[PDB]
């Protein structure tokens, strides 16, 4: 059943048109010929049906129990999205050169956060499609609940890691409505750390109910 | 006598060629026709002869005692600097256009941190002088020791302020070799804060002897 909000270490196998596209197995990543030089592998810690992952796996994680695995089939409606017509627009040649780009069929461009694909350069105006690569297609998914965590101190720690990979270890210290985080002496030097902290905060609050204050204690010592 | 290292709230009147050039009196700033839209006025907290201010006032603060004032006269050797010949160099026209600037007599330019003044555009090469405006001249100074602070908790606080004006209030909490700084809830949002903190640290250590660890405790709460 897995209540809404309880942290789960899930692990996913993602197929589309038979070919595998997304997963958490690095050894399987080589053996399929796809690898992200940025993504972190192993059981991805997510929250119970809080809309963290795809809505289809989201409802499926709810149905599932700790340890249980299945071949979940996700319709495009409940997976990546049904291909919106209005998301196919014809953007002029100006708004194109205005971004230092010659319109090239196939080449993809971004307008206002939303990226998109040049379909055909119609002498004058350009046809661009703003739908996700995997929109409309149906995904065969294989998800397993690797473990569940339900002890505040630890939950916090996982969040911290979910946001800053480099932060494998930290002292948490719950004192009723407060969550003390004592970060390693290298922490204050992480590029864009304050941002993280103030995001790490959000989540700790947004999820952990017996928490109304988050604290980051940084230390400096001389050599 | 004022021992080396004890924090002092000094206040300065600075004359050069009769005209007043530097001071801590905002009301006198208008009444003389010079004002920095950035500088903060009132007794500037500095450390006892640690080379914080001009070496001349530095040795004079040592001679002086709390409350005492004088008309200290500073030679260019012990004030701003004696005008170095080698600091007058002839930089080529390339290194000039290479910085998007047409060489103009009077206009000042910077090369490698060190700013300097275009003296004469000698058809081909440019004569540039890299000496501080007030170098060579002699300064008439009027300095008064407004107060002295010698209690750790408080000393810390002044440093914090010396670095981040916005931080008028903070909880310090000395626990033997450690200095706990508890910063207001807006602190983590100050632009370039980590930098400050890690600088604030330095000083706290560099000065306060019974301190080997500095700590910054930031907090986040939701609205």
């Amino acid at each position: 059943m897995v209540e809404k909000g309880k942290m789960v270490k899930i692990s996913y196998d993602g197929y589309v048109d038979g070919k595998l596209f997304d997963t958490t197995n690095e050894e399987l990543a080589k053996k399929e010929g796809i690898y992200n030089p940025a993504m972190i592998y192993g059981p991805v810690a997510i929250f119970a049906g809080e809309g963290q992952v795809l809505p289809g796996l989201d409802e499926a994680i709810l149905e599932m129990d700790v340890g249980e695995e299945r071949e979940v089939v996700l319709p495009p409606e409940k997976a990546f999205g049904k291909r919106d017509p209005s998301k196919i627009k014809l953007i002029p040649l100006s708004e194109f050169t205005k971004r230092g780009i010659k319109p090239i069929k196939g080449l993809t461009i971004t307008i206002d956060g939303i990226p998109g694909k040049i379909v055909s350069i119609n002498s004058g105006r350009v046809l661009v499609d703003f739908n996700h690569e995997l929109a409309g297609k149906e995904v065969k998914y294989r998800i397993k609940i690797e473990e569940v965590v339900d002890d505040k101190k630890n939950i916090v720690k996982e969040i911290v890691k979910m946001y800053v990979p480099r932060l494998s270890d930290v002292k948490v210290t719950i004192r009723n409505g407060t969550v003390k985080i004592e970060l390693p002496e290298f922490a204050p030097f992480i590029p864009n750390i304050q941002t993280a902290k103030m995001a790490i905060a959000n989540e700790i609050l947004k999820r952990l109910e017996d928490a109304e204050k988050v604290s980051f204690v940084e230390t400096f010592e001389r050599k």
Side-chain angles (χ1 to χ4, degrees), chain A residues 1-222:
Chain A
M1 270 68 264
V2 187
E3 308 306 306
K4 60 151 188 172
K6 288 177 187 177
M7 192 173 61
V8 203
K9 261 186 174 169
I10 70 100
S11 176
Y12 56 104
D13 274 5
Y15 294 93
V16 56
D17 290 294
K19 189 195 72 69
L20 193 60
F21 88 93
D22 214 342
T23 192
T24 45
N25 190 334
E26 197 185 315
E27 222 262 28
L28 201 68
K30 325 282 182 184
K31 209 177 274 183
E32 289 289 71
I34 201 154
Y35 184 96
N36 195 315
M39 191 193 166
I40 306 289
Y41 296 81
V44 180
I46 69 102
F47 273 100
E50 297 276 81
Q52 208 106 178
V53 286
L54 313 169
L57 308 181
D58 233 25
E59 67 178 25
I61 261 87
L62 294 165
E63 313 310 308
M64 279 154 69
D65 263 322
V66 53
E68 311 284 74
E69 193 225 81
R70 52 182 63 179
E71 192 94 345
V72 272
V73 184
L74 306 191
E77 328 209 23
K78 302 177 80 63
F80 277 76
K82 344 86 203 159
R83 306 189 57 167
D84 177 63
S86 288
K87 280 179 198 271
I88 281 185
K89 284 194 171 189
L90 281 78
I91 291 95
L93 186 69
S94 65
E95 201 82 289
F96 248 92
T97 57
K98 289 174 161 166
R99 296 173 178 272
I101 34 153
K102 177 75 169 283
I104 283 306
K105 179 185 284 191
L107 166 64
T108 62
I109 73 108
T110 306
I111 287 180
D112 305 322
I114 319 145
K117 193 163 175 197
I118 296 162
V119 181
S120 51
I121 310 144
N122 308 273
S123 292
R125 214 92 71 188
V126 183
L127 171 68
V128 196
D129 194 338
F130 301 121
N131 290 303
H132 190 79
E133 171 72 299
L134 298 96
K137 311 275 192 189
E138 184 169 39
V139 288
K140 200 176 77 172
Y141 255 91
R142 207 199 290 177
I143 52 177
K144 190 181 176 184
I145 293 173
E146 292 285 81
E147 73 171 54
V148 176
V149 200
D150 45 7
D151 46 293
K152 297 154 75 185
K153 210 101 133 184
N154 230 37
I155 291 166
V156 179
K157 295 189 79 181
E158 274 283 69
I159 304 161
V160 153
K161 201 178 85 186
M162 190 204 161
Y163 280 75
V164 197
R166 313 184 195 196
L167 289 176
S168 295
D169 59 334
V170 272
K171 182 108 87 182
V172 203
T173 321
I174 323 287
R175 261 195 301 261
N176 332 302
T178 52
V179 173
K180 185 192 268 173
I181 318 282
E182 297 203 273
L183 321 140
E185 215 178 354
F186 81 100
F189 293 87
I190 307 166
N192 298 299
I193 178 70
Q194 289 298 350
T195 324
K197 302 204 287 150
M198 74 194 200
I200 267 157
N202 272 355
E203 195 82 322
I204 296 159
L205 310 142
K206 214 182 195 282
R207 297 289 160 270
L208 212 153
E209 72 300 76
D210 283 298
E212 300 160 340
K213 309 276 267 180
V214 179
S215 46
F216 289 104
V217 186
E218 302 153 63
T219 308
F220 298 102
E221 188 192 319
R222 205 157 70 202

